[PDB]
Design a protein around this ligand. Structure first.
Ligand SMILES: Nc1ncnc2c1ncn2[C@@H]1O[C@H](CSCC[C@H](N)C(=O)O)[C@@H](O)[C@H]1O
Ligand SMILES: Nc1ncnc2c1ncn2[C@@H]1O[C@H](CSCC[C@H](N)C(=O)O)[C@@H](O)[C@H]1O
Ligand SMILES: COc1cc2c(cc1OCCCN1CCCC1)N=C(N)C21CCC1
Ligand SMILES: COc1cc2c(cc1OCCCN1CCCC1)N=C(N)C21CCC1
Ligand SMILES: [Zn+2]
Ligand SMILES: [Zn+2]
Ligand SMILES: [Zn+2]
Ligand SMILES: [Zn+2]
Ligand SMILES: [Zn+2]
Ligand SMILES: [Zn+2]
Ligand SMILES: [Zn+2]
Ligand SMILES: [Zn+2]
Lengths: 263, 267
């Protein structure tokens, strides 16, 4: 039987609680990491936080016009536009503290936090995973990939390379410090896309990673994104993809078929 | 000018937990707009604040941090907040200790007892035009003693940068020595006037970082405050040695900086 292990893995840090369930095995709530809601530093990074360096708008409205300096890819409901390049996404510049606009303007989606109801759950083959507890329309903001900010050289020397997100060159490592997104599994048929966002600062070395639904997501459906080739070139030697989709490109079988395809 | 008019519904532009309206029933002065309202301190040059999460002293509390075992409370001497988020009656309102609130490195929940200042403005305040001191800040409700009012927010600057600034009216003194300058970038607290009989006390607080060069300034009521009462604190002698260009218009029987007070001292 499916049991609710933890009522909130975020410990009240998010807008909504993120419960943890397990109806697959006897694994307890993971506690080998520190849940953080915002990105952290473990060495001097000196993020350029000069308020005068911020590109900002002069809008006195809610920022729905084409005249907003900060195109604005959000619609009235905070969703990415249908015409948004889900293949090669542009950089998003949300409104900030230098903008003359109100805190509740239409260009502050990611900075307003988690709004969708998510659950941490035990998958059959991929350990822990994240699923939707509600229907999620296309282009809705899900969560941010939060972790520890580190150099690519620091990433290369890390014992655990399982929770790394490449920024461009810098990485977010969610191994020791992370949020709900450190539990999102790889899918060869993904339903979320990562987006580089700028909010309170505009230092190009450190974009913030925001996940948006790339299609309408059904209740109970597992969230996942394409981890990319860098992860799968390192990791395939140790384990293969268990997504079980008909389009799987990293399975063991798919790996055996392409290795045999040449000869 | 005769009747009190609402000049702005929210000077904070939705940035605070509550709207901070502006009124004027004294003169023709419109809503001040010669500054940028910010809800958190800003920087205009590298302050190199130590934000290394590993440098944070944090607690191991698995409860709500009400026990004497809370490392964050022990640093503050004891956690000075009561159950309702108010400073204790025994709190040194004359020489306040440094407050270390819980942070992101603490194992405790976001709703623990040691996170008052980091939760923002809860009291209802108004920006209003005073008779003699330009703009001022008053309570739109009764405020018990030890309640958190607002933070003194502004631009972080060196003492050397402060010395060269044309306007020295919005400075709060905190790598050597640093200042908060609310002249160009500030929050509702840049409008709080000096009172020789003050009802608020500034407190040095640490939250997300513990870089001792940069405490955050939190105002707490030093006594029970009545509705409509003007908020004010003692600006101290550094301001009054430079400024007393003009004299104190607080009009209290205890005034130590009025033209009358300065004349009686010298004579
Ligand atoms: N499609 C996939 N197939 C197999 N394992 C996967 C997977 N996507 C993610 N994983 C596993 O999850 C790791 C990335 S971190 C994602 C959360 C992880 N399941 C957990 O329980 O903490 C991978 O290195 C691998 O161990
Ligand atoms: N007790 C006092 N008497 C006279 N002027 C005062 C005062 N306290 C503050 N002020 C005025 O307010 C300045 C500090 S900033 C406080 C807000 C200010 N009244 C405004 O309308 O912008 C002082 O430099 C002085 O100009
Ligand atoms: C093994 O995976 C990676 C390894 C590395 C990496 C990124 C990786 O991850 C790709 C993105 C999958 N993750 C997205 C969030 C969680 C998984 N950048 C690096 N410099 C290295 C090379 C050695 C360190
Ligand atoms: C003239 O006043 C000050 C001048 C200065 C100052 C502090 C002053 O006042 C503080 C106390 C009243 N303020 C509290 C918040 C708003 C006013 N720190 C400085 N380095 C200087 C010396 C030259 C710049
Ligand atoms: Zn705008
Ligand atoms: Zn805006
Ligand atoms: Zn803007
Ligand atoms: Zn797959
Ligand atoms: Zn504690
Ligand atoms: Zn705590
Ligand atoms: Zn703590
Ligand atoms: Zn006075």
């Amino acid at each position: 039987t499916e049991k609710i292990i933890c009522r909130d893995v975020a410990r009240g840090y998010e807008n909504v609680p993120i419960p943890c369930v397990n109806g697959v095995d006897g694994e307890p709530c993971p506690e080998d990491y520190k849940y953080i809601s915002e990105n952290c530093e473990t060495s001097t990074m000196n993020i350029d936080r000069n308020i005068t360096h911020l590109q900002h708008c002069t809008c006195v409205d809610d920022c729905s016009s084409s005249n907003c300096l900060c195109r604005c890819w959000y619609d009235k409901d905070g969703r990415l536009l249908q015409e948004f390049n889900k293949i090669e996404p542009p950089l998003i510049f949300e409104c900030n503290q230098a903008c003359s606009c109100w805190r509740n303007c239409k260009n502050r989606v990611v900075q307003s936090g988690i709004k969708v109801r998510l659950q941490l759950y035990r998958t059959a083959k991929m350990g822990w995973g994240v699923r939707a507890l509600q229907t999620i329309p296309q282009g809705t903001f899900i969560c941010e990939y939060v972790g520890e900010l580190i150099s690519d050289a620091e990433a290369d020397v890390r014992e655990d390379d399982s929770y790394l997100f490449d920024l461009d060159v810098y990485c977010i490592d969610a191994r020791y410090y992370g949020n709900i997104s450190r539990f999102i599994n790889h899918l060869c048929d993904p339903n979320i896309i990562p987006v580089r966002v700028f909010m309170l600062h505009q230092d190009l070395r450190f974009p913030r990673i925001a996940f948006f639904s790339s299609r309408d997501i059904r209740t109970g459906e597992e969230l996942g994104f394409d981890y990319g080739d860098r992860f799968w070139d390192i990791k395939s030697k140790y384990f293969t993809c268990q997504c079980g989709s008909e389009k799987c490109k990293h399975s063991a079988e798919a790996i055996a078929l392409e290795q045999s395809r040449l000869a």
